[PDB]
Design a protein around this ligand. Structure first.
Ligand code: HEM
Ligand code: HEM
Ligand SMILES: Nc1cccc(CNCc2cccc(OCc3ccc4ccc(N)nc4c3)c2)n1
Ligand SMILES: Nc1cccc(CNCc2cccc(OCc3ccc4ccc(N)nc4c3)c2)n1
Ligand SMILES: [Cl-]
Ligand SMILES: [Cl-]
Lengths: 362, 362
């Protein structure tokens, strides 16, 4: 009766999907062909139209995402035809290149073959396609601590990092039938990076900070109508606070706040001086300034929250129930200066959606 | 069987309360006297010891409170003996004076007679004993908009505000048997106020901002062992962000951020400049600096979060389950710079506790 889950989800997804596309008359013929298809083969195949709209629905349903205003303009690349490692690798390369778009990031998702009967066809190990290695031994911490386990796994497979603070991890993924993943160094010409400078404080460049242009989340499962697309990397553009308030500020990541305090010329001695708060603002100002100056898409949390308010209004005008996760939608800098903080949201889980899945490493 | 709720709550409260006080042998005799007392009279009376510890438990159980480390040092004033308006008024005056303590705020609660059989003995109308009036007519907004309905109610009763931005509301409460509340002007010698200056920026005084020293929450119901103390005003000291990030910053309160931006010499034109963020930090620095300089107790959100971490550790060392409301415990300035943001909390409701109750006005 594992088959029955799939028939139930397909009924719910096709009905809602064809309704939004003005194809409601076709739902009944398409469901019959679907019902025959699972009886015979155990699964069914989405049309390009269903797959595209389902990926957009999944984004629209992501309770934790503040950028959902633009769900309908998601650029869906259908790569369910890939069978080899070189095709996986080149499709990932292509995703980076087309999503990057010389700095004007296009929200893009590349969709690989789904799980057949729980068996993955392609298993991506990267958390993001572009992200820095992290090392910790002999008391020395180098790079991004969030990447330490993946970096250790990559170096079991013959890869070796330069041990800078910004080593690019290679693409790492495993094919069905293979016992071990393969890895491929990223072509540096494809990866845009942004040096972090400050608009007013020339000494900020002494910190030698940088970040990559495009966050491409590559380890979540896209679930559309009972079909599990475990390999479906997607990207938007950064909200500035993700870099300035978390990646570069967490003690547990790059932990730069105390160095930021020094170069902006304030003491880091007393809690009552709010030096962490002041450093966070100047760092976050630097990130936004630096991405703008290089021509790489980014959004500040105020503009992002205004956009999300329009998403809330678009939802009701459309008759669609709104779902959201208050604890993730508030930004980590001045959350009470956004409207999100002052209302409530139903955190109900609606499908299609993106979901966590177990890491193939530890 | 309304009586049965009360017997059940008394069993749970007395058992837990006598256990913590090392009086576990006495629980059984005390419960018998209690059980006789409700059968005969319909209710029971707490000892000073039970009332004191129950008020402390209620504070320890307040999921939304970050200052719970100090729950056991709460100063409990037992005023269940009051019968007249003058005694209510003088006990409220006394609370202000003793909680203020010339600026070294003592966390204090004054406990008035409880509800008898749903009938309140004293009904306090103030949200806080000390707070500013708010006016809005003919497009003009004056004072604190949060106080507009209460201020309108006070002026129906013969009170008239000066229409400054910082009119002190009078004490306003109703006695059992009376159709209308009485009101009493606060003696200004009892109310400490703090002018807001900035440690570095002399022009900040041009804003002419101030706040009162002691927040004394006066409209919550203390529930201890089935006894409902609807009139039980309490105070701690402010966390700085309550004044700097909410009272003075909300568009919906004093809405000062745009004026703060001007006097600290930054433009308020572009979201990407993070001018709201920068103004929030300087305003919050000014509040902490001003309270310190005057000698009025206050805590910054970093120190407060460190204290709450000790509360978490004290809880487990004591074998007590910890409850908390993540959405209220994170501070509204740099929440991700505190440990609270990076963990989860069980928001379960445990009694004794403090609860909302309907306003007697609208
Ligand atoms: C267009 C620009 C986008 C922006 C600015 C944006 C912004 C964000 C932010 C700030 C978060 C929270 C991260 C944090 O709190 O640290 C988030 C979460 C999320 N976003 Fe978006 N997003 C965008 C596009 C997308 C796209 C294209 C998708 C997928 C198609 C997506 C799906 C999600 C999901 C699934 C989460 C939650 C992941 C998790 O629970 O860990 N977003 N988004
Ligand atoms: C000693 C200093 C204290 C500090 C610094 C403190 C801090 C706070 C803060 C910051 C809040 C949240 C307000 C907001 O998010 O805007 C809060 C909520 C609360 N505190 Fe405390 N607190 C203190 C003492 C007390 C005392 C003495 C009591 C009662 C005996 C108490 C009971 C509560 C309750 C019941 C709430 C939640 C009220 C609601 O839901 O609206 N606190 N506290
Ligand atoms: N807020 C909050 C609130 C509470 C806790 C956290 C944890 N916080 C760090 C974190 C951990 C894991 C994932 C993550 O993010 C994922 C993600 C997915 C898609 C995105 C698309 C665009 C974009 N710009 N970012 C995205 C981030 C964050 N965070
Ligand atoms: N965080 C958060 C998170 C979400 C929403 C809010 C709403 N926010 C404003 C607000 C409204 C009502 C009450 C309130 O506070 C009550 C209170 C009670 C006791 C205190 C004791 C000491 C102290 N220093 N403050 C206290 C405040 C806030 N807030
Ligand atoms: Cl990231
Ligand atoms: Cl307040």
């Amino acid at each position: 009766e594992e088959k029955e889950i799939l028939w139930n989800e397909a009924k719910a997804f096709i009905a809602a999907c064809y309704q939004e596309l003005g194809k409601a008359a076709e739902v009944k013929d398409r469901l019959a062909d679907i019902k025959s298809e699972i009886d015979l083969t155990g699964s069914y195949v989405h049309t390009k139209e269903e797959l595209e709209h389902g990926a957009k629905m999944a984004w629209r349903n992501s309770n934790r995402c503040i950028g959902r205003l633009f769900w309908n303009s998601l650029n869906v690349i259908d790569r369910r035809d890939v069978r080899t490692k070189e095709e996986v690798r080149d499709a990932l390369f292509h995703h980076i290149e087309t999503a990057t778009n010389n700095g004007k990031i296009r929200p893009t998702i590349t969709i690989f073959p789904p799980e057949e009967k729980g068996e993955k066809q392609v298993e991506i190990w990267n958390h993001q396609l572009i992200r820095y290695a992290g090392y910790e031994s002999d008391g020395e911490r180098i790079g991004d601590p969030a990447s330490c386990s993946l970096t250790a796994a990559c170096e079991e497979l013959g890869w070796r990092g330069e041990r800078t603070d910004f080593d690019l991890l290679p693409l790492i993924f495993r094919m069905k039938g293979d016992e071990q993943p393969v890895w491929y160094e990223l072509p540096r010409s494809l990866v845009i990076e942004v040096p972090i400078t400050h608009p007013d404080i020339e000494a900020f460049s002494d910190l030698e900070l940088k970040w990559y242009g495009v966050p491409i989340i590559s380890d979540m499962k896209l679930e559309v109508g009972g079909i599990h697309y475990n390999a479906a990397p997607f990207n938007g553009w950064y909200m500035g606070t993700e870099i300035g308030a978390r990646n570069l500020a967490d003690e547990k990541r790059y932990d730069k706040l105390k160095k930021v305090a020094s170069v902006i010329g304030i003491a880091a001695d007393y809690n009552t001086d709010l030096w962490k708060d002041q450093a966070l603002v100047e760092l976050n100002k630097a990130v936004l300034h630096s991405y703008k100056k290089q021509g790489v898409s980014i959004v500040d949390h105020h503009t992002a929250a205004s956009q999300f308010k329009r998403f809330e209004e678009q939802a009701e005008e459309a008759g669609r129930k709104l779902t959201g996760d208050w604890t993730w939608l508030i930004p980590p800098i001045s959350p009470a200066a956004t409207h999100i903080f002052h209302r409530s949201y139903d955190n109900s889980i609606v499908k299609p959606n993106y979901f966590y899945q177990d890491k193939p490493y530890e």
